[PDB]
Design a protein around this nucleic acid. Sequence first.
RNA 1: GAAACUGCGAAUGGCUCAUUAAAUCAGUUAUCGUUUAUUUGAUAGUUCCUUUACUACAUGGUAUAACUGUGGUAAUUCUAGA
RNA 2: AUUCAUAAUAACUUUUCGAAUCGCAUGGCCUUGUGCUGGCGAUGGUUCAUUCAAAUUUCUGCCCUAUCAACUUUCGAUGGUAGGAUAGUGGCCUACCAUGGUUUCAACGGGUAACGGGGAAUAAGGGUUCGAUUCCGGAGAGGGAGCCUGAGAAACGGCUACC
Lengths: 260, 59, 134
Amino acid sequence: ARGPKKHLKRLAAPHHWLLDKLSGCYAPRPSAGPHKLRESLPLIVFLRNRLKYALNGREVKAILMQRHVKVDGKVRTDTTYPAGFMDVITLDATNENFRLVYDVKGRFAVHRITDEEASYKLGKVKKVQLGKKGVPYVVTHDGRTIRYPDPNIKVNDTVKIDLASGKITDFIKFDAGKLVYVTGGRNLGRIGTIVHKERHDGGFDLVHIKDSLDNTFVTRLNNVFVIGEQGKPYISLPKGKGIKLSIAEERDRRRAQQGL
Amino acid sequence: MKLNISYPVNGSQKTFEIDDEHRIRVFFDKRIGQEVDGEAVGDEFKGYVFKISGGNDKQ
Amino acid sequence: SDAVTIRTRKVISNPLLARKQFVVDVLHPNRANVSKDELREKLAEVYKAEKDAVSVFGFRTQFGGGKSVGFGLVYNSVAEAKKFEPTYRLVRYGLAEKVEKASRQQRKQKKNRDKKIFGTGKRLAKKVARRNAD
RNA sequence: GAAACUGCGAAUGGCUCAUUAAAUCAGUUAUCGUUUAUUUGAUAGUUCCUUUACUACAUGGUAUAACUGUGGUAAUUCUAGA
RNA sequence: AUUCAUAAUAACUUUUCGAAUCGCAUGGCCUUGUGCUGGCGAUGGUUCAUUCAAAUUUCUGCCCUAUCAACUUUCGAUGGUAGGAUAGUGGCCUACCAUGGUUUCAACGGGUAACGGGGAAUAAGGGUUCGAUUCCGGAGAGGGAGCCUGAGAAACGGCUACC
Ligand SMILES: [K+]
Ligand SMILES: [Mg+2]
Ligand SMILES: [Mg+2]
Ligand SMILES: [Mg+2]
Ligand SMILES: [Mg+2]
Ligand SMILES: [Mg+2]
Ligand SMILES: [Mg+2]
Ligand SMILES: [Mg+2]
Ligand SMILES: [Mg+2]
Ligand SMILES: [Mg+2]
Ligand SMILES: [Mg+2]
Ligand SMILES: [Mg+2]
Ligand SMILES: [Mg+2]
């Protein structure tokens, strides 16, 4: 009440951060940024908890302000900077890069990309609109406004950013039989190929997605994220490829690995 | 009462006590900004002209 | 000999802090525990360090004694160790000295006393001096 | 780097359950009915005195805190005159 | 789905913004000069988008009571038109007009030793009872009312008045 909140109590934090219940009363409240705080991964959570490069928040601040970590090629010394889906994190040391994608178990995963993959990213068009002076623009999911887009670009389409300059190199239309990603709902982390989409005027269009080995499911259009055509994706996939194999099947792989 | 009389061109300021309350009534029923002679105020102020800039009552 | 048999595990290079982190297990039969200074020294001649770039944590001994496990950092020099490590552990290891601060309550009380003062206060100091010397 | 001016915060947190019975709240909606500091992305070649006033843009001036001093009140994080 | 986004014409403005700001390196060309030209940032700064929000908001769902059966409406009750006011919709307020609106499918009134919920105890199944209290939402800072500064307060470790 009386104004915006500044504290995020622990157990109110998003569960996919995988914060422990003890060792703290509060959780890192992500700052205002490109991503909504529910589906954003703060740099303190990614460093201290996911990468174990820091032991405490003070060391996290020491890492951040030195101009070590650059998010999408920009330093962003904010501790709770809301890094989200498809974001590219480059580290000056160790000569390696991470992309931020979910795993099939519905949480952001440490995925290592090369430099050529780090040199770009894919985003989802939230809207296409004419601005002042009639310049058209596309708004991605990460709050990027790019002027003069291709006229064939429509809403919920995928655009490849150059990440060093605010331009689009190419795009993928929203059409049937194109490999996609899921960023919402119970299917958080899946990767599949479209079957069709239902019209459903007035709100909440529904899309039917088929997995690699025919695990057919449906989800809202809001959660869909086109990533390529049949095979040959534009983004290297994380460990798992978002398939959601059964509990008994992963039990088989675990007893295979430790039972040899 | 006491008079915080200040000469501004050199920034000098001194306090003079003026008893004989039947002579401080030249100040009476005047207000800030009203010029008053120095002759009635005192036998020391021949030709000095003052003006009221402020004050502090008892309390 | 005593045969501590100090083994380092979970070793990770962290050039982001110019240090290597690890957990360390020490096996000390018929011995209570291991001293931090001697453990830091042994880590120094293991890593060809100079006994000052080494920091240690924990060493929660198992039940019944005989084995301790704790965290450890080995740096590249004194300079980044002194810039990255906390003051309290610097005072532990003897590089720096504990700063003589007043207790927290009287520090706060003095700050609240200074809140009631506008400016330096030499004006009111000489005014109360005049009132005391009238 | 004391002080002070400026900026920002102080609307968060923390506490309590008095009020409150379609009120609050829960799930679910709408803003094609609005405000939004700050973060992130983009984003002002046009200022011709409100023209026959282009007079400094190698860059306009006022008035003040702080500080120096005179003080008043028993007293307040009171303050006035220069 | 629009009188949308935009764009064009005609004008209007206590004429809003369009850098008289700060730190490092201080290069290139000679017309060798208080010559020309230059990066890394920081704080700013109209507008759009994004984010953290907020405010209103649709549907459905609350305990006991008829020893509570009618209730609301000159003093806004329910609508219409226009205006005012607000960030904006809207009887929110005003003027004029119409006479509506709820109710035994329990309105209205009264009581609550009532903050609501996630939940807790018990539990064959079905249920019963509790939830001031860790999380979320609301409300309040002795009781009312009013208000300044601000993006955000009807703030109280802000102010003003009364008790
Ligand atoms: K009306
Ligand atoms: Mg609060
Ligand atoms: Mg109206
Ligand atoms: Mg109550
Ligand atoms: Mg409760
Ligand atoms: Mg109670
Ligand atoms: Mg609460
Ligand atoms: Mg309140
Ligand atoms: Mg009390
Ligand atoms: Mg403010
Ligand atoms: Mg109040
Ligand atoms: Mg208090
Ligand atoms: Mg408070």
